[PDB]
Design an enzyme around this catalytic site. Structure first.
Site, short mmCIF file in Angstrom:
data_model
loop_
_atom_site.label_atom_id
_atom_site.label_comp_id
_atom_site.label_asym_id
_atom_site.label_seq_id
_atom_site.Cartn_x
_atom_site.Cartn_y
_atom_site.Cartn_z
N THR B 15 8.07 1.82 -1.45
CA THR B 15 7.60 3.05 -2.15
C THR B 15 6.33 2.80 -2.97
O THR B 15 5.71 3.81 -3.42
CB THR B 15 8.71 3.61 -3.04
N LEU B 16 5.95 1.53 -3.16
CA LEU B 16 4.80 1.13 -4.01
C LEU B 16 4.05 -0.04 -3.37
O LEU B 16 4.68 -0.81 -2.62
CB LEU B 16 5.32 0.63 -5.36
N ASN B 89 10.85 -6.99 1.80
CA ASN B 89 9.67 -6.98 0.91
C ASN B 89 10.08 -6.84 -0.56
O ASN B 89 9.32 -7.33 -1.42
CB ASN B 89 8.69 -5.90 1.34
N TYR B 155 11.36 -17.78 -9.46
CA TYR B 155 10.60 -17.16 -8.35
C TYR B 155 10.31 -18.21 -7.26
O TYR B 155 10.58 -17.93 -6.08
CB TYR B 155 9.32 -16.54 -8.88
N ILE B 190 -2.38 -10.21 -4.94
CA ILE B 190 -2.76 -8.90 -4.36
C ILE B 190 -2.87 -7.89 -5.51
O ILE B 190 -1.95 -7.87 -6.35
CB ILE B 190 -1.72 -8.43 -3.32
N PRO B 193 -1.17 -1.50 -8.61
CA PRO B 193 -1.10 -0.80 -9.89
C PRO B 193 -0.37 -1.63 -10.96
O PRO B 193 -0.77 -1.59 -12.11
CB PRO B 193 -0.37 0.50 -9.54
N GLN B 251 -6.51 -25.52 -1.14
CA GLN B 251 -7.03 -26.52 -2.11
C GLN B 251 -5.89 -27.12 -2.91
O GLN B 251 -4.82 -26.50 -3.00
CB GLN B 251 -8.09 -25.94 -3.03
MG LIG Z 1 -3.14 -26.65 -4.24
#
Ligand SMILES: [Mg+2]
Ligand SMILES: [Mg+2]
Ligand SMILES: [Mg+2]
Ligand SMILES: [Mg+2]
Ligand SMILES: [Mg+2]
Ligand SMILES: [Mg+2]
Lengths: 251, 251, 251, 251
Positions: B15-16, B89, B155, B190, B193, B251
């Site tokens: 939805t977002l 997602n 996370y 990314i 909003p 990197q």
């Molecule tokens: Mg690195």
């Protein structure tokens, strides 16, 4: 000799197999060791088999038990002085595909393999930081943390989690000058009395398409890399994955 | 045009932001889409903004809700016919080091980010296998599934789990000729909003030491790789990690 | 003590910095060592600084010199008996982007860093296989074998090549029961008299966005992981990458 | 349609198999294409088979030929206008272990597979940077850039080199705002008339212990991921590895 001079180690699931070999080599190298397990009958005998109470003791504990971690650190410090070294080795396996994994199996395996490693890593950083101990958290993170196995879905989830959560902890400890390193060890298939109890398991694991060396390892193979990582020899190693797998992941 | 001809997709958190861009491009390419979100007010308006009820509908659902997944697959099949495509997602973030993560934060983030992806992947294989749909499970698995961040401990755990659990599922589906592929998409930073609501976030993410391109991406950057993975163009891709990160992990 | 009892090691570029620390720790652990370098003046003094001719000798050699590798193995066997252990440590660097790399710079760096490692690995397998030596080929393969650096294009090419060519060699040796293991060591930034000669280098390498530990390592950090890999302690490790980088690649 | 509107692509080894499928899909999506090959007889017929001279032409070239790269870029710009897109696809294989690789075989394979990719990447950055073309360098880098094969030693060296040299180039291009992206594509086993000429090859490649999908891919499987990477759809992807391997590397 004496590669772990003055170190004080907790080894979860240290009463059998890989954990017991790590405890044995840690004591041989001069560490004081607290081993954990579920069963006092196995754990007390294991500790006495390795050394004297000044060298090694047992603490009964399920790694999924959050409050027990507090008691485990407190018991280890009472016995041996401040903890320098944590090996998050305790784990269980479910032989199910993701498709066939029950939610009960999922939650039980993650409680030991993921929550247990989180609880031990979090408390380890809190209790070992800023004490000049040359502190080292060694998380057992499996070849199943690099590659999938179609029949180890929940196990794969747990070992991938440990792999990258360990990098987070390593970075925070490094950036804050905590004097705490965090690394993962990734065993391939290792001969344990347990593997010996599953008819045909060692032969299947030894096929060249699985383990290119054409045989599986032994608990001491994991003990020796853990000695390196617990020691001050590895004082520049943090956030790294150490694989001992007879070539499983190289193909 | 029509790169997803005949596909029926579920997109969690559609939805977002990223999920809405994936839903938009999926509809543009001829898929029927069910988007999920927590809030009917946002979700109904989002679906209508993209297309007609024959193209896209909303289903209110928290990805942590195991029983709701059953209702979600049943609602999607009732609306559009058999489900071919699942994008896991939906996710949440906790900005804590492992050291500072409360057990409540740990369990809440893993309920959405890990249990949710497990529940959707497991049910997806069960409902989409052996139907000649060219079925595709796309798990959102983050640059935080490759590298640590000292302030994203839980996370990191969740995204490493999704990364390697997805390989397990991919292998089982491939070995059993299920006609189901499983792959992970690994966004770098990314612009959403949401990022826009955190003062200084986009600038910090855009520093060359973070994102070498010196700017962050946009939701369409993730939508286009998801179109490839949902389409039959990617019929030989399974068990793979697709990174779109402006060079963050290079990197 | 005596972790390399009876081992006979060749260490290329063993007269300075990392190679000299590896040679020093190898001798301390009971290996006989042949070190190579370009300059007899540096090499002879280095060997005498570490031990007696029964423990360590120098052999003048450019690792790019294919025919010299034959003479080097023959000289080492004449001095010490059959070679068990090869550390392909000799390397050079060009501080150019791919865009700015001259073909001359490209060919010169690959002659040392890639051809040299190939020539030593190929000859090592031929001379050390099937002799029950517990043979070990340790290829120096850099954090630049995992991540790019915009100003080390040719160096990145060489270190990625060494990383995956080493896996090929490991697999062939394992599948054929050659009693030869092949592994790569991946140093992060290490303080050497050379780094000391580049004003501002150590400080730039020590920034938290480069090395999270906020300092660079020392040659002994690489010596200790090489002792593990040369020893029979690592008899189940082959085809693996061992990273010692102060957290560089973990973020 | 028109996903490569206005793009001008060079595809090395574009006259057969994977390269020809990439050229075919590039033309179908609106790119102008110069394909290279060793043999005018094959190359001219291949170009005419795909489209008109305004869409696709042939340029005879060995990718190992440094001076020929200049002539190739000049011919492509004369035909089609400024080059936006380079696919370094030309490669050769030697079926030897590292142990059995002759130095002649080593140098010949690296001349094509590594020097060729270096020469094309270097010249591509120089000629395509700062022109607002949305330029894209796609380097063919193989599953043999991730895992060893005991019988592809030199090939493994070349593909590991391409993998990490591509990250160097990606980073330099990103940090300097060159408007040039650099990514690697990593095919698993793909059915080509060539594989068809090796009796038993496709069956061996299709065994579940090699390719879990139990069959090999087709040239279009590589063409479609190259369309994504050449297009502006992938404008946030740089320094990334895109694997299309039927699950080979997931186990
Ligand atoms: Mg690195
Ligand atoms: Mg005593
Ligand atoms: Mg309509
Ligand atoms: Mg003596
Ligand atoms: Mg025309
Ligand atoms: Mg594999």
């Amino acid at each position: 000799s004496n590669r772990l001079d003055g170190k004080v180690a907790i080894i979860t699931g240290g009463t059998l197999g890989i954990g017991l070999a790590i405890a044995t080599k840690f004591v041989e190298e001069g560490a004081a060791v607290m081993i954990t397990g579920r069963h006092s009958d196995v754990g007390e005998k294991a500790a006495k088999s390795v050394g004297t109470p000044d060298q090694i003791q047992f603490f009964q504990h399920d790694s999924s038990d959050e409050d027990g971690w507090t008691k485990l650190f407190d018991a280890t410090e009472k016995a041996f002085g401040p903890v320098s070294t944590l090996v998050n080795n305790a784990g269980i396996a479910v032989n199910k595909s993701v498709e066939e994994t029950t939610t009960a199996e999922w939650r039980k395996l993650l409680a030991v393999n993921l929550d247990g490693v989180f609880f031990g890593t979090r408390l380890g950083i809190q209790r070992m930081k800023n004490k000049g101990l040359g502190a080292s958290i060694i998380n057992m993170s499996s070849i199943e943390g690099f590659v999938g196995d179609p029949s180890l879905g929940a196990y794969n989830a747990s070992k991938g989690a440990v792999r990258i959560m360990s990098k987070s902890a390593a970075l925070d400890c490094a950036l804050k000058d905590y004097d705490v390193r965090v690394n993962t060890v990734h065993p391939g298939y290792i001969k344990t009395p347990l593997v010996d109890d599953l008819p045909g398991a060692e032969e299947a694991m030894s096929q060249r398409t699985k383990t290119p060396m054409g045989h599986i390892g032994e608990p001491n193979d994991i003990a020796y890399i853990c000695v390196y990582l617990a020691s001050n020899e590895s004082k520049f190693a943090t956030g790294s994955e150490f694989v001992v797998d007879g070539g499983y992941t190289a193909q």
